[PDB]
Amino acid sequence: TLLNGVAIIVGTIIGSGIFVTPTGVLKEAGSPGLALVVWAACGVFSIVGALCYAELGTTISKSGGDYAYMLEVYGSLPAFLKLWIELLIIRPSSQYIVALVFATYLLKPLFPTCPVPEEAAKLVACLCVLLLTAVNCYSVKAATRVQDAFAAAKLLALALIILLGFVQIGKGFEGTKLDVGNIVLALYSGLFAYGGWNYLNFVTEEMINPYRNLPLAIIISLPIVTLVYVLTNLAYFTTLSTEQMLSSEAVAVDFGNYHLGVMSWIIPVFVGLSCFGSVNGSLFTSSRLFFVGSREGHLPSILSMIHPQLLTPVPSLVFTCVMTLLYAFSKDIFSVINFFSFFNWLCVALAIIGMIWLRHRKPELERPIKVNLALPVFFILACLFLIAVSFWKTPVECGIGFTIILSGLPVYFFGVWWKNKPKWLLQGIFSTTVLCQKLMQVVPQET
Amino acid sequence: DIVLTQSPSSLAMSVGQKVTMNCKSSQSLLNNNNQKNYLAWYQQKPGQSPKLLVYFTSTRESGVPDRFIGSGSGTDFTLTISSVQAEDLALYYCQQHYTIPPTFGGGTKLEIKRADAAPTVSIFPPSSEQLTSGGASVVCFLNNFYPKDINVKWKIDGSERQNGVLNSWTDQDSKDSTYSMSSTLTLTKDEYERHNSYTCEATHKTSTSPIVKSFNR
């Protein structure tokens, strides 16, 4: 039923970014009044984004995420560059960010006033990503139970902040910056918390049967998310000063330290567990892209393979993990959120541009959902707006990111398009492959 | 820092006359809050220390004659001497005191003009003690003349000498406003031995003919 559909999508969208990003939107919007407007604006942008993905998630329907659409709309090089961006930028950086929020919140009660030491925050971030990589390698039968449980902690911590906010009001604004530059970084910080809908929204179609009911699940759910995000920010702003919320890397622990008295055993624990759940989830669900990307021939054959006694996709996890662990070389959490956001929205731009170019090029291709053109023609321009400002508001992050993208062209030619014929090269590739197979004990999946 | 241009660099003027130095600052030295201008003037006579004349543009220091009047505001400042005396030849520097570290002008050399006068010329044979050294120095003094421009010919048995001749002028004398000049010729002992008659002759704009002095060893 539709009511139980909404309870699947809202619990998918809410994420862990809500525990990072309040400080982010407030730093760029200057004062609470405009921060709440940015939270709403991010909601509305997500409603327009989600319904466009309701279309692509039912017209093309090929499994594996955006890459599966790029094979139809572009093929060849742009399909590989989506996979390359998503495995070296997007899925690493969003794991590191949630692994680092985990680390700061787990540590913050040992450092109540003074900022938690970065050299320790980064080790504890890495200890989390490695431990959860090991658990996903040892047992899908265990790592599923670790995902089933901590989805409760995500909503328990976030509801507790709101009910504490209500009793604060029961007992009981200007927008001081308005530069278009900063407000795009406020939007990046606020949009990060909604960042589930492009990966997984189509899952609800396997239990909500009519195609017109999938838009109803979107249009009901994303206002519910927006409500929760606005209410949690009101819970902070009715308890904490702007000059407190910009000082603390873990703002909900400040709020928890004010109200609870038992503070150490509540907000740090329940929010920590939500992020331990969100890092686990991003590892568990990663395999799908490697299987698809190697089946469709873009990605090296070893990264398809599985350890046959445990049925866990060991070389894909170990690659995912080591990419996440390199983001420990980055400076600051909101640096990485800006970086993630640029390439995330630039990928969504290529997808929704693609959808309109496809509606032009192949009309009436049996679409179960067909949205009004008036939505994408605003939304594409909104993606372009964020990117176009960010080129000059945050140049250096885009520079190193485009350096990653351009470093994809060599491995596209060498690995896929040029198909370099020398037998010594092929025997070298094979030798390297079987070394890994023997050294991890891994085998191909059933074709 | 502030920079203080000063002009003219030289100001030759006659006794009794009024004279003006200009000082010109690369920022204003009016303190808005207080309505006074931070500047001072120092006189530095030849061979002595700077003496302070006026400060805060106009305030005479104690022990300063009342012929020094300072005036101006903003950036155009002027020290004026109402009636120059012979004792007044010096360099004068302006200084700002609107910031520390302070900075100074490159200074105006006041010079005196007087009625022209011909040099007293005298020549001195080498000192009998100096002849022990293997060298000898012949010296010609030109005393109490005006103006500064002069030249000297050395003659040695009638031959004109232009190697190893040196000159030094005094600064202008504050009692009488005259210059004086020393001229020196240095010889080996055997170079002083081989020639008999030594002549110093001086041409100065007060006479068509040179003035002459000489000796025979």
Partner: protein, 220 residues
């Protein structure tokens, strides 16, 4: 009285440090800050910095920062400027000066300057040679007498005649530098009655090598 005094002369081998010193008298030494100002020849006065005797705080122009170093000794009312890394273009006269108000920079009281010469050439005491007119000397009513000072170093040599008694009618000509040794001459004029009848001496004096000499001007 307020009176600052300083050593007359210093010689410095290039690159070496030097201490120039200024002893105050005539006022409460801690009440007023002490400034150091310099006078490069033909290039205008330049201020180094100042020091507060009450706590040895000191404040320096940007050009001297780290190159100079002021200290002070409250037990003797003495202020000391160390200078360091001296080049030939740091040859100058260095003047010690006192403020009127407590630290504000205008300078009513200055010490007589310390002449700092930066040169590898060695200290060289002066050779003094008297000058007397010779032939036809007494044929004129006034007679000139002289004192050549030759081959000396460094720059500051002083001449006075008859221990400063003949302070009237003396001309001493600026020194000329030759082969890294100075030459200077001094002259005086007296009545023709005086010179053969009385003592006449150039009292030559040299601060930087302590020699004092009184050559008598004897006829040929």
């Amino acid at each position: 009285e307020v009176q600052l005094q300083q050593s007359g002369a210093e010689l410095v081998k290039p690159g070496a440090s030097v201490n120039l010193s200024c002893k105050a008298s005539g006022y409460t030494f801690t009440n007023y800050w002490m400034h150091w100002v310099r006078l490069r020849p033909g290039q205008g006065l330049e201020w180094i910095g100042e020091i507060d005797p009450s706590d040895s705080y000191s404040y320096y122009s940007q050009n001297f920062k780290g190159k100079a170093t002021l200290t002070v000794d409250q037990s003797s009312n003495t202020a000391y400027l160390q200078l360091t890394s001296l080049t030939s273009e740091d040859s100058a006269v260095y003047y010690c000066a006192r403020g009127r108000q407590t630290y504000y920079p205008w300078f009513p009281y200055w010490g007589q300057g310390t002449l700092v010469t930066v040169s590898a050439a060695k200290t060289t005491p002066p050779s003094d040679y008297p000058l007397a007119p010779g032939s036809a000397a007494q044929t004129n009513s006034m007679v000139t007498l002289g004192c050549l000072v030759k081959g000396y170093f460094p720059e500051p040599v002083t001449v006075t005649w008859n221990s400063g008694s003949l302070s009237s009618g003396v001309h001493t000509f600026p020194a000329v530098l030759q082969s890294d040794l100075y030459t200077l001459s001094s002259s005086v004029t007296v009545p023709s009655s005086t010179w053969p009848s009385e003592t006449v001496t150039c009292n030559v004096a040299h601060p930087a090598s302590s020699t004092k000499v009184d050559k008598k001007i004897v006829p040929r």
